[PDB]
Design a protein around this ligand. Sequence first.
Ligand SMILES: O=c1[nH]cnc2cnccc12
Ligand SMILES: [Co+2]
Ligand SMILES: [Zn+2]
Length: 328
Amino acid sequence: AQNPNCNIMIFHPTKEEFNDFDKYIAYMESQGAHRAGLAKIIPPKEWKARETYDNISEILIATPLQQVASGRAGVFTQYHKKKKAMTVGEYRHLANSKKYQTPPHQNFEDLERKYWKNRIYNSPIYGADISGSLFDENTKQWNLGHLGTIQDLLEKECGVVIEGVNTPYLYFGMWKTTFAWHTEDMDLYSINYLHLGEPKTWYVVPPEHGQRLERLARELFPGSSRGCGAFLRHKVALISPTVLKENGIPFNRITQEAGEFMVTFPYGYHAGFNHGFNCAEAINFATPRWIDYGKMASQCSCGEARFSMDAFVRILQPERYDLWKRGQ
Ligand SMILES: O=c1[nH]cnc2cnccc12
Ligand SMILES: [Co+2]
Ligand SMILES: [Zn+2]
């Protein structure tokens, strides 16, 4: 068995190896990369996402989200308060203001300490889930807007044509902006490219130990757990590495820097935070290996969890479809 400790692996593809996306994901998995739930891919030195990021200030963040926390420092929930629209230019200025800027710190470790100590006492603003792409049309390798669609993968594996499209999303971050503990919709893969700016720190639980995190989450968020069988789908729960360690939950951490890809694997619970102003692009994808995870994925049917999903539940989980559809 490759990667038995479930360590987060870092890959350095050659330009030749960067030419076939599916092939390289399969290669990574042949080395046990998936067992960690998360992998870093450093692109070839001659590769670039686009020419410059000098012309992105006029992008609109239609609904910036202020992330308001409740609970204790190491165990909290966050809700999203809608704010008025602003451009990326205006958001960048806000991120860099005294109120929101990254504080002085010695290193990544110091910054992590400051995040978990202080996160709940501030409410940063996040430009999340903006449909669009910053990859240049002429970028032919690992262009997140030119990946094979999940609908086409499902069709190729299961022989059924389905409706739906899947397109990339942009995420404009600032210091303390947070992504809560979750797996992807239908336990899909995700790929995330950090286009520009300050780093993003990730935490991840190995897929083979996902149910351990769920069990702890039910204990730590008893109210939310009673309300919904798969409340982590709401993407509101944060648990610190110190608390995970106290409870014996296996996990790993890694910091992603500008110009680097991260891939999350089926049923790999993950969470994290941004160091400062940055922009990431992400999309879900599937491989043949995903199908069996899709079949087993837990669903939020309470209504809280946030189009393409219909067909995946309909085909892969026909028994769950009616009840799930009532929640929607
Ligand atoms: O960077 C991220 N921002 C918001 N949500 C996420 C969910 N999963 C992974 C990364 C992110
Ligand atoms: Co995710
Ligand atoms: Zn729910």
